[PDB]
Symmetry: C3
Subunit: 141 residues, 3 copies
């Protein structure tokens, strides 16, 4: 997963970002058994007067966009659950701190993706489980 | 709509950005009566020697990328019209100020999107018309 | 092609960025005769404690994402070749300098794309060849 989180400048401390990125990572570890290192979260500070909503600056706004590469979600129920779980992980840092926020996901081709130069193994394969156990990309054939 | 506009550092004043984001919002309001707050425009300043076109730094270049989430464009005619209107709104700020520029759009899944933790209502629904009237996301069932 | 390259602060000098974007550009020029100016590379410096991998800051990490707009890659072999050649161009600047790195591609619709306000010509068309030779969008 590839997460971008656009925030007001200095909204989050390093400890905040660690805790939030840990919560996001736990989504994929708990629900999909993904290797932890698949989960990338990029925090991007946005100065005042750079984020515009409906033609007006919103300096109290967190905008989230992510790509899902590793898996495709095939049912309405699973797709709704992903959005629900995402909101649960985010709420302590965003909603409950008074920010406005919005989030969307795109699904991108699994075969156009490399990590440390390696082709990630098939979903739910024994090799994927090994990558998850050691939490690193291990060369294989 | 989710717009990213990468510009040279200090290309636009806060007033420029408000006027441009307003022009962008008007595309969607005028043609379909979309809720205004669906339209997000993110301005990102890029310092010199960070944007490379054909292998050479171009410090006079505005690159625009957007996601369409709320609606799909189903005919060639509508898709061409969208690009035409986009160029019209952009021209006073970009082309006419001597910038080089390029723009593209991706369409992403409508059902993997939440605003203020809420599921946006169906297109052309009474609830969508209410969201547009109040220009706020209102909880519903 | 639309490339975003996220790096640790001050990882690359202007000369580094010039050479790397030239290498990336050579992919499309050499293999498909794409117009050079189609290839855009954006470098984004990321300060310490802004890139998190598996819940921990990785301050030694280069993340690459690109969109392919102009054409689609229709076979497994071509799609694999693209990733292989990309890794080859990147290695002298990233892998060989000791960074961790990751890359992925999305394919976006050809007909929702304009450059200098113009409709790009059809792939492999006579007009595309003129755009490539002059390396600029020629009204037509
Ligand atoms: Mg896409």
């Amino acid at each position: 997963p590839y997460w971008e989180i656009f925030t007001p400048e200095n909204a989050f401390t390093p400890d905040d970002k660690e805790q939030l990125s840990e919560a996001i990572t736990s989504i994929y570890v708990d629900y999909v058994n993904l290797p932890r290192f698949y989960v990338v979260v990029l925090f991007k500070d946005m100065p005042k007067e750079t984020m515009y909503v409906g033609g007006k600056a919103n300096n109290n706004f967190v905008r989230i966009r992510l790509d899902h590469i590793a898996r495709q979600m095939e049912t309405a129920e699973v797709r709704a659950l992903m959005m629900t779980v995402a909101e649960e992980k985010l709420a302590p840092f965003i909603k409950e701190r008074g920010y406005d926020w919005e989030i969307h996901i795109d699904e991108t081709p699994m075969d156009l993706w490399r990590t440390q130069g390696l082709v990630p193994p098939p979903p739910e394969s024994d090799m994927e489980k090994l990558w998850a156990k050691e939490n690193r990309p291990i060369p294989y054939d």
